[PDB]
């Protein structure tokens with residue numbers, strides 16, 4: 533009955549349904565930012581979603597800004613992720629790795645040699661940041677030299693190479709929620725006077741250069757990108773967001789990527805917020821000719837309506853999938869939804885992570901079986 537449960541052809545990846553597990557930072561990486569058998573269980577549990585997008589995964593230590601998030605820049609991290617992608621896949625799931633660089637949303641205590649976080653311009657975000665040594669005020673970041681942007685692009689390329697060896701079906705470029713690429717896009721944070729600043733074309737340049745680089749590793753139909761066209765999250769602002777994101781989406785459309793993943797304005801990064809904006813998925817559907825994922829604040833009823841009225845092709849769910857590993861089955865049965873517990877979103881252990889229940893206990897047993905086999909396979 534539900535279009536949400538209709539299988540979907542993602543250019544040769546046949547997704548079981550039109551529901552996506554949104555990327556969700558959970559801060560449960562092991563030593564040296566290496567994924568664990570518990571992470572493998574978590575994703576295996578959620579393999580019933582048509583497509584999984586991982587938690588944001590830093591391409592370098594410079595690109596990290598929160599405790600215990602996983603990386604993709606070392607061989608040990610690759611081998612940890614192999615456990616995850618093997619357990620997914622054995623459950624006949626499909627999974628893309630979200631590539632991250634936090635830009636100015638970090639702290640020198642996370643950085644190599646106690647260096648400052650990097651950014652397009654030396655402007656600190658408002659407020660405070662969690663560090664190993666307690667909550668601290670944000671620092672003014674270091675503005676990147678023109679010649680340094682290519683090195684960060686190369687970090688994305690190397691991250692894509694590692695994602696491929698880890699077995700990911702594809703990769704998603706995180707260009708949303710106030711991190712490095714988003715900081716370049718928007719003129720509230722990008723004050724540069726070189727070829728990466730000024731015009732809308734110049735402000736998008738770094739994004740196109742990242743896409744150019746990772747599309748030398750993965751074919752374009754296995755590279756997605758995530759944008760947040762209208763958010764105040766992490767002190768973001770731009771003088772003409774309709775012009776900026778119309779240009780960007782129109783350019784992205786010509787590149788024939790895997791998909792474009794858009795966050796609805798009613799979400800401020802990780803929380804709900806009331807807001808009047810026209811820059812929702814309906815604004816962008818006519819501007820983008822490919823696969824369009826809509827995310828942010830959806831329920832069963834509103835996600836289904838987005839698909840029925842052809843405003844998007846796939847609907848991503850974040851907090852509901854945290855709490856409901858078998859969310860597609862629950863939707864199909866019109867079953868209750870387990871409530872999501874924000875207190876256990878970030879950090880911690882199995883509690884509020886892998887202990888949310890399934891409708892069918894055999895589903896939980898199968899996820900455990902495949903996670904355990906993957907751990908033996910890739911120990």
Ligand SMILES: Cc1cc2nc3c(=O)[nH]c(=O)nc-3n(C[C@H](O)[C@H](O)[C@H](O)COP(=O)(O)O)c2cc1C
Pocket residue numbers: 554555556557558586587588630706708709758795799801802803827828829830848849850851852877878
């Ligand atoms: C705990 C938590 C972690 C998140 N981590 C990420 C992330 O790593 N990368 C990202 O692009 N978005 C992240 N988000 C935003 C979500 O992907 C999603 O857009 C948001 O939760 C709104 O969708 P929802 O109403 O379905 O939860 C996170 C959100 C939450 C609540």
Ligand SMILES: O=Cc1ccc(O)cc1
Pocket residue numbers: 607608611612
């Ligand atoms: O560099 C150390 C290392 C450890 C375990 C691995 O699987 C790979 C590399």
Ligand SMILES: O=Cc1ccc(O)cc1
Pocket residue numbers: 557588598708709801802
């Ligand atoms: O750590 C939390 C987080 C929130 C939003 C993101 O996009 C990425 C990470």
Ligand SMILES: O=Cc1ccc(O)cc1
Pocket residue numbers: 559560598599600662878879880
């Ligand atoms: O890794 C532990 C952790 C806890 C709370 C956070 O907000 C982030 C990370």
